[model samples]
Target: DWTASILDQAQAPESVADFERLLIGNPNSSVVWMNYMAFQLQLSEIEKARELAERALKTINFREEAEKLNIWIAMLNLENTFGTEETLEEVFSRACQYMDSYTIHTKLLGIYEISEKFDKAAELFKATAKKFGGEKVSIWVSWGDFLISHNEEQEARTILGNALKALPKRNHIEVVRKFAQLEFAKGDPERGRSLFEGLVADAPKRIDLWNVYVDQEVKAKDKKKVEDLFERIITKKITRKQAKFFFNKWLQFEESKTIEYVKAKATEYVAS
Candidate 1:
């Protein structure tokens, strides 16, 4: 029973009563529900606002009630800020059943991270990232990086591998190298040998990738592998910064191996 002008210039308490009257006749109105909720917020009636938000969602379906659904999402964002942990969790949990937008999951995730609800956060991110079909590289990165932060190195490896499988190779340098690095850190040089070799094959222009590839081979101490790898690093056209570090590492390995080989050969010559 309130006028449109009243809606824009309304305050708490009395104006809240006017909107309640409006809701009596038109309870399905998104604007009416939103305004009522806002009045409750302005008055610091967080419980009332949370109650109104739940009512708003009941008034509309995801397809036909876009306004109601969106207004409800807006309300939940406020609840996340003002509500208790139990209240904040309830608001988001209900919203997910109706629609799982990136915005919804993101706000929900912000709370999850702040609370260190990482196990729950990991499950949620896994579901939502799968919901987007792995093309959402940032989400995959967030999930992988979270695993890294938790020292779930193996789980992190699998997450990055999933990214590589779904992401297009032409634009996959960052993720591909990240996965390869995970393998390298697993302490078995052979585990990442093929991975980095493929990366070097596909991204030859990336001096950094070649540098890591050579370092891995040197760690394995396969003289034949090191000789072949350094052949590529030495022959390739790389930047000056790359050459300095690359040359130092290459010299250290090659200098020791050359001396070892000469010592063995001189002993054979002395016997002859």
Candidate 2:
């Protein structure tokens, strides 16, 4: 195959001619043209290489064709460095037509973020996660984090809220905490307290969440509220890890106050 002879095309004067002939002979061998694109890249003709990569993708049957995804990835990487929004969006939209992969979705999401295309970023996050990622907690977290960075706090809260709604499982507990943080940032630390307290009531063993709630109370100097939070935690079914870790936190918090409460709880924790 003429394609085989063109790998090290950087110094071979005839390599370009050979590659052209190869594409001419088998225009649909998407995999074969990668070498030609590779050559164009080595020649510092990045724009030209992106062009050929797209052309190769159009020729190849992209459904799981190794070359199809590879070419798209190369096109994306190239655009990430030097291509414009039009090229980035074009290549991503085209790639999504034949494949639904988390990697593709993430890159597309990133392209939107980099372009400061907030609306499109939100739109793609919703659709791409459902289509390819099963709407996992992490995807929601990622979208919310991106929105938060862009100061889209309300929208981030919505996304994280949807995550908790979509999956009422242990794994999604963290998203709830994230939403609570958004509440705190929204200048309503009490909202976060109420929200986290509800979670603590239902999932009493979540020591991690209890700690976050205590922080809000401390800021308000509601030392009594923090004490009540720690007390309730020990009353629930405790883990050895929680007992040790949470017990330490409760003790240190009361260093200036009487440990009567803390001392009693430690005994309660050990006996119970």
Report lDDT (Cα) of residue 121, candidate 2: 79
Instruction: Tell me the tens digit of each residue's lDDT in model 1 across 148-196.
Output: 6677767876877788787776547776665555556543456467778
lDDT of 2 by residue, 94-146 (tens): 77776656767776666567557778778888886576434456677677677
User: What's the number of clashes in each of the models?
Assistant: 0, 0
- Clashing residue pairs found in predicted model 1: none
lDDT of candidate model 2 versus the reference:
0.68
Against the unseen true structure, what C-alpha lDDT does each candidate score? 0.66, 0.68
TM-score of 1: 0.45
**Global local distance difference test of model 1:** 0.66
Error of 2 at 201 (Å): 2.8
Candidate 1: 10-residue stretch with minimal lDDT: 2-11
Best by TM-score: 2
